[PDB]
Copies of this chain bind each other. A is one copy, B any other.
Amino acid sequence: NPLRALLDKQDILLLDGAMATELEARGCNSAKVLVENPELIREVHLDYYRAGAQCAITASYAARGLDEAQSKALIGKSVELARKAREAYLAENPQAGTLLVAGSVGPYGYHCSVEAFQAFHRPRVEALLDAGADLLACETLPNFSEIEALAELLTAYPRARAWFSFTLRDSEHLSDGTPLRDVVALLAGYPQVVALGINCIALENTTAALQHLHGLTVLPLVVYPNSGQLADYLPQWQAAGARLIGGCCRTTPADIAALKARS
């Protein structure tokens, strides 16, 4: 468990934020930057580590024209860059403790078979795991059937660890309508899933959602919503069992810096 070392020493584990915002500042215009401007992506990760983030989440959301062996080299490269920045930060501040790189697995795109979802995600899971991600961020998941497929797929790789974050229709249901009490009940049978929560969601919908999950599981809860203060919710969220906190769309290293201070 990559989270056990940290959660035994501190109440809050800090995540990073969006990537696009920092890149826009440096004059960027999706996975072209991994080839043409890899140094920028290296620097953005370094900034978040500096602002106080303890876990980095990867860039570059594969491509038309490449086979699936080229895609993994691309996907893997984003993990490598996050790793380079981490080493760089550990050289600067040796007293910074344990830092992690999380490889991202976003949603498909609907209704598919479990095996259809598994064939789709398997390239990326292996690419991220082989590249050296400490854990897998299964995020922005709206579909229950797709959730099953990912948790089953993970069992093929015994050393993999992951969290599962979802999008919501309301405070009690997935975006596809599935009741949260079923999603939790499912994932409870999967020890590899080490954390649960929500992301890419509006701020004023986060707390109720967390509160509901808070009653269904004592797994560390994960929260990183979109920008409007984000650091102002940290008390409510922590009380709702949230232990991994960061930001999504429209967030910058500044929001994470605010979080560091409030913890």
Contact with B along A108-139 (1 / 0, CB 8 A): 00000111001100100010000000000000
Segment of A72-80, A148-156, A177-185 engaged in the interface with chain B: A148-156
Number of contact residues on A: which range applies? 20 to 34
CB-based contact A252/B50 at 8 Å: no
Segment of A3-11, A18-26, A232-240 engaged in the interface with chain B: A18-26
CB of A253 closer than 8 Å to a CB of B: yes
CB-based contact A93/B115 at 8 Å: yes
A156 to chain B, nearest CB (A): 4
Interfacial chain B residues near A155, Cβ < 8 Å: 22, 25-26, 47, 252-253
CB-based contact B115/A254 at 8 Å: no
When chains A and B are docked, how far (Å) is the Cα of A253 from the Cα of B126? 13
When chains A and B are docked, how far (Å) is the Cα of A22 from the Cα of B189? 13
CB of A92 closer than 8 Å to a CB of B: yes
CB-based contact A157/B126 at 8 Å: no
CB-based contact B93/A25 at 8 Å: no
CB of A27 closer than 8 Å to a CB of B: yes
CB-based contact B192/A157 at 8 Å: no
CB of A257 closer than 8 Å to a CB of B: yes
When chains A and B are docked, how far (Å) is the Cα of A54 from the Cα of B156? 18
Return 20 A-B CB contacts under 8 Å, by A number: A25-B154, A25-B155, A25-B156, A25-B157, A25-B192, A26-B190, A26-B191, A43-B152, A47-B155, A50-B114, A50-B118, A51-B118, A51-B156, A92-B114, A93-B115, A122-B254, A155-B252, A156-B257, A157-B252, A158-B252
